[PDB]
Design a protein around this ligand. Structure first.
Ligand code: HPA
Ligand code: HPA
Ligand code: HPA
Ligand code: HPA
Ligand code: HPA
Ligand code: HPA
Lengths: 233, 233, 233, 233, 233, 233
């Protein structure tokens, strides 16, 4: 076991969906999986394994923030032998071409974190997903008729930004939304030779000032869930 | 409401104890509080209001890492009007001056995070607790027979450090242990003119590699809990 | 009509292949295009407009280094209305996962330059290609039986490096090779909202110390020229 | 002897007060100490030993800036075996919580210097004083009826600031005033396992642009001298 | 013998003139040297060797940007044993002490590049020319009747700047103009124990927006070519 | 007047010599000047005006460290209208190109301080002296028969260094010696459009560990004082 997962080894399938919200994890396990069992629950961070259309899949929560995500992704890879990690989270739009409930594929993850400078010689690590997972999602979304918005996200240490006047420059550089784990997911997967991709649904628009309740951040995003299950199966 | 706390404005007392683990927050409420009320549970992150020896007190989980801690503390101060915040968490010792079960009062929280450079003009913010809160802890500690270890902590973005060979330097400069939220608690409380303190129980030693039994984990925790509740009442 | 390009507005087609070496640009206009006409030659940096399988293509040299490349693709995009930019260049491999003759698709370009911190708020810009260009590249490579090697490159300010002891860490973090322009191309195309992608041919390999002859230095470069011209056509 | 102190080993009591101004040091010796004796004068940086209420106290000037303060307290600790160092200096208020003539106790010392990043792995060292001196100062102030103002200082490399528009932000983050040495004193004492504390007399207000007259400066200074002598004896 | 120069070892005289533009290199060989042969032309970057007033002089293009310049200057020194490198280029004035046609000698080259921090311990390398070279330049200019404008230059990674509001700050700090190589030339010559100096002809004034007509630029370059050839002979 | 200088305006001649140590300022005034008057003495930092070869010259101490130097030369320039500032200090040699007794002329001053980054856009300020002063120093040393060692120095925030491993790299990049103020003198004079130069006497060699006796220290210093006075008249 690990200090943050109390599952047995072999309890996780090699493919894992990830959310920050363990209650979103639990909702997916009960609604979309067959024969799902809760396999971990340290610090209330639920994880499950079940079957979707006969194929096995696991779900794990990773909390909020690069440091929290990095903790769970490292243990998933190093102890429980997960090899493919699909984050399906939420994000706050900064592009005007993206609206609430849009699905964003993160083809790179910029950050105001220092974690990647610490990892990578104090230079610029360009944190990116595994291309093949990235193409599976494009194909699967095409096949399901999901309009996937494709671009960079900005992975921040701040949910309440101190740099709102910089959102326009970020959008200009093809950052579609802000979220808080993708750079941590991408850089840890790169460190440990795993395959990762981040999808995110727009729960907030940071320009036009719309938002979603804590409840509809669990249940307004079924298209993203089905997309993730379908491409892992 | 806020996106991460579904309490009603007025449900929190102006004094709040904090843990990273929402189950540890749960342990405190069932074992030590009267009239304990669950007031929030977004993302399984639990918070409570109850009474200790007739005095109102709140409890809130904040998750792992500076980014996550910053979210909850920002919302507790800005929206729920919490004024005093006492973190009681776990840590890994790096100093020969402290051993397993020791309680550490963090008079400074160094960090490898970039969050305070972003906050504080790209300069060095010296993240520190409120002095009257630290004095109150020290007087209550002496009055209970607890021997406080008092020095800096190092709040890291990494649970799995890439710089273990630097722990000696950290301990040279009076860093007693490593945790992952203190700097975030301290900087947020400084930003928003609130009073904060971090207490940490040594649950592992990262140099001697000693750890505690899950049984001993709890009585050490019980000492820190009573100290915390006695300070606040 | 710009300081570094003396063509006339309109001389360039909206699609354009790029190399550092302007004699490869010259080589491609003479060997693969019909009606090859040289439109610019400031500072001996040659550009052409031709046709391949009937469709107008342009070519341009961008020089060595992020700063040179940035000057050229800036002026291409802003004044000469270019919209797609496909750099095809040579690199030194550092990863065990690629051998010589291999073609690399850079899904991200890390860097030791400061240019992106200057562009992007002193934060970490994940410099990435346009996704539909890298999709077009994947499909066209599939169709011509080329096995694209897909990962990050490291765009350095240094040809003669001072950190050769770090090439392993780069390759561990999925950096397949080193070159000197991708990060600038990707950032500039992001800034000015044009589509860009960088392909690289494994000229030599800086860990195996292996290389091979100038006659083979041209077969592998021919493969990449065809892939590039096919996907733009 | 050292390159900046020409006293004999043993000429310093293990407790030492410090000012930047050596004429302030001399003033303290003449007006408050019995059997006062000059013991060093290299570079006109005067130091003294003497007695207050029959107990031995030393006094030393340390000049202006972190660099100069660091030299003198490194030599006091390593060569002359000073164990407790109490800086009593002047400062410029930036916070509406203090006014002219106030005494500040610096529980933290932020900085725009690079010195702590060179000492401390390019991370953020939170430069803090020894807690028992802090407590001794708190108690002695109460005993004397002094209202001690407690928070951070900003130790700058600049007396004539280039960032006067950031003063409100610094005050927001609980920086009560600016001086030029407390961060060096704190970091050097942490490096060398000594006890240090910084007190400051507000002799200027950098926001209102008012300063204490010469005579008021001397009165404010006398209160701090008495507090310092009372707590060291 | 080097990947970027295809001359035999010995084609270069130990003194070399450099320009960014290899067609400026050519023009100097054809109009000013006797017995001028071409010695290198990889990537269309022309070098020559010839005679001026009976004495040997070489010419070498270095391309645009510090990374390009560092490649050529590194190979000139290390392989072709060049010992003195005189760079003569164009630049955009920012200071009111200089006008168009003025010739500038860079007694320092500031920079927004990271190359010198990578080279020099992540500190500030103050990149400067060889003093004896700068003394020849000065005495020769006096003999020829040229009024040299002497001060710092700012070597940028950007022809198209993102900090035009800061040109006034640069000019206040004795930066006479902006160009893109001197800092790389100076740093590389310092690393490898060679003598380097940069002269620059004011083509534009980025403040007054004034520019030179062609011819007028050709005649300003000529004054600098002769200064450069006289001081090497 | 100013907070660190109590002379009256007009008490300083426009030319002024500087040492870190005010007692050396005093020695110069008493041994080398006629009609010497002490004009300032705040904080025991002595300054003088007097005659040499019938011409007026001033002298001022500036303390140890960039921060302290910056204070004094800002006030000398802005309030007392000093226009030429010639620092004559002592230094620790690190290069094999120089031995004891040597006099170094600093054509640039590198640093580990953040002061210039804070002054200069967080880029690399190359801190340099006024060329005409350095030309005067060269010609006067020629006439006086002094052999000038000419190159960079490294201005450090540290007398007791944490980076002795790196002295050889510094010496490779033409840093002949280490001292603690040249970078601040140069940067402030640039800021405020004054003429500055630093000369340093080699009194210790930090590599060969050799040092001058006290007697030889004053003979070397007297050489440099005569050079300074002669070039200032
Ligand atoms: O508004 C946001 N900012 C940062 N991360 C987020 N994740 C969901 N919404 C947001
Ligand atoms: O071992 C530790 N390291 C980092 N964080 C921790 N939190 C509890 N223990 C530790
Ligand atoms: O080794 C290399 N480094 C950078 N660019 C290159 N292009 C060919 N080889 C290399
Ligand atoms: O204005 C101030 N700034 C810095 N240090 C000071 N010491 C007294 N006043 C000041
Ligand atoms: O005008 C200029 N600005 C920036 N870089 C340059 N390189 C040549 N001229 C210029
Ligand atoms: O070696 C030294 N280092 C820094 N400053 C000095 N001043 C005299 N010697 C030295």
């Amino acid at each position: 076991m690990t200090p943050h997962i109390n599952a047995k080894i072999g309890d996780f399938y090699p493919q894992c969906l990830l959310c920050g919200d363990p209650l979103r994890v639990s909702y997916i396990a009960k609604k979309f999986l067959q024969d799902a069992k809760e396999i971990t629950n340290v610090r209330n961070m639920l994880g499950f394994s079940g079957k979707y259309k006969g194929k096995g899949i696991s779900l794990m929560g990773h909390g909020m923030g690069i440091a929290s995500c990095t903790i769970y992704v490292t243990e998933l890879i190093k102890t429980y032998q997960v090899k493919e990690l699909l984050r399906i989270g939420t994000c706050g739009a900064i592009s005007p071409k993206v609206g609430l409930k849009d699905i964003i594929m993160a083809t790179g993850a910029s950050t105001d974190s220092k974690t990647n400078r610490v990892r990578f010689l104090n230079h610029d690590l360009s944190a990116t997903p595994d291309f093949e997972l990235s193409l599976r999602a494009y194909q699967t979304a095409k096949r399901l008729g999901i309009d996937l918005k494709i671009g960079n996200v900005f992975s921040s240490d701040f949910f309440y930004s101190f740099e709102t006047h910089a959102f326009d420059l970020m959008a200009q550089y093809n950052h579609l939304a802000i979220e808080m784990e993708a750079a941590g997911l991408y850089a840890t997967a790169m460190e440990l030779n795993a395959k990762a991709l981040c999808l995110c649904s727009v729960s907030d628009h940071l320009i036009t000032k719309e938002a979603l309740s804590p409840k509809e951040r669990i249940e307004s995003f079924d298209n993203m869930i089905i997309l993730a299950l379908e491409m892992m199966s």
